[PDB]
Amino acid sequence: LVSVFLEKDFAFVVSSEADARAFVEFDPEHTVIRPVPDSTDWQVIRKA
Amino acid sequence: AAALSEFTDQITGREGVLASAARLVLGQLGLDDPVNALPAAPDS
Amino acid sequence: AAALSEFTDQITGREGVLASAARLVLGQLGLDDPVNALPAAPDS
Amino acid sequence: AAALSEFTDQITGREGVLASAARLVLGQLGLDDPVNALPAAPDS
């Protein structure tokens, strides 16, 4: 059994824009999206 | 005399100061979205 | 006039300055360990 | 090209930031004590 709640930064990997969008398909009501052109992706950052 | 290690050290400390400020200063970034590709396809 | 919100705001900003420094200053903390309970049982 | 002087400069500025925070942030350090040598002598 593990149940921890996380409110912090999400460091990521080089994914495509479509793969980032498909990752954040379930996310967008619990998070903030920020695009990174240097890694050509997005970054999800989820709240409490 | 490869100085690139301490160059990355001062860049990492600088970006750490950035990440220290950025979340409690409530300066929201990444509020933009690439939209222009979406209406360009029904135009074509 | 409940001021406890901004009290926690300045405490959180202060601790954020702490956490900003603490990992790149390489000031290692938590290097101690509670040892004393371990030899106290074979003594007893 | 002896860079050790400015190495110690950035280390001294970093430790100065540490000493700037450390006394008003009320993060108490040095609260541990080496105890283990004291009961080890009546055990022996």
Contact at CB, B24 and C16, closer than 8 angstroms: yes
Chain B: residue nearest A47 by CA? B23
**Distance, first Cα to last Cα, chain D:** 56
Extract the tokens encoding B23. Answer: 């979340």
Q: Which of D32, D38, D44 to mutate to test the interface with C (most CBs of C within 10 A)?
A: D32
The experimental technique used to determine this model is: cryo-EM
Q: Is C21 exposed, middle or buried (0-12, 13-18, 19+ CB in 10 A)?
A: buried
Q: Which of these, D9, C15, C38, A31, lies nearest to B28 by C-alpha position?
A: A31
Residue C16, classified by CB atoms within 10 Å of its CB into exposed (0-12), middle (13-18) or buried (19+), is: middle
CA dihedral B5, C19, A31, A25 (to 10 degrees): 40
Cβ of A34 within 8 Å of Cβ of B34? The answer is no
CB pair distance less than 8 Å for B12 and C24: yes
Please say whether the beta carbons of C20 and B16 come within 8 A: yes
Tokens of A13: 């990997």
Q: What is the DSSP string of chain C?
A: ---HHHHHHHHHHHHHHHHHHHTTTT---------THHHHHHH-
CA atoms within 13 A on the CB side of B27: 6
Read out DSSP for A1-48?
-------S--------HHHHHHHTTS-TTSEEEEEETTTTEEEEEE--
- Taking one residue from C and the other from D, the number of pairs with CB-CB distance under 8 angstroms is 30
Contacts of D3 in chain B (CB under 8 A): 1, 3, 6
* C43 touching chain D per CB within 8 A: yes
Torsion angle of C-alpha atoms B36, A27, B27, A18, degrees rounded to 10:
-30
Chain A contact for B32, CB < 8 A?
A: yes
D29 touches chain B (CB under 8 A): no
Q: Chain B residue with minimal CA distance to C19?
A: B20
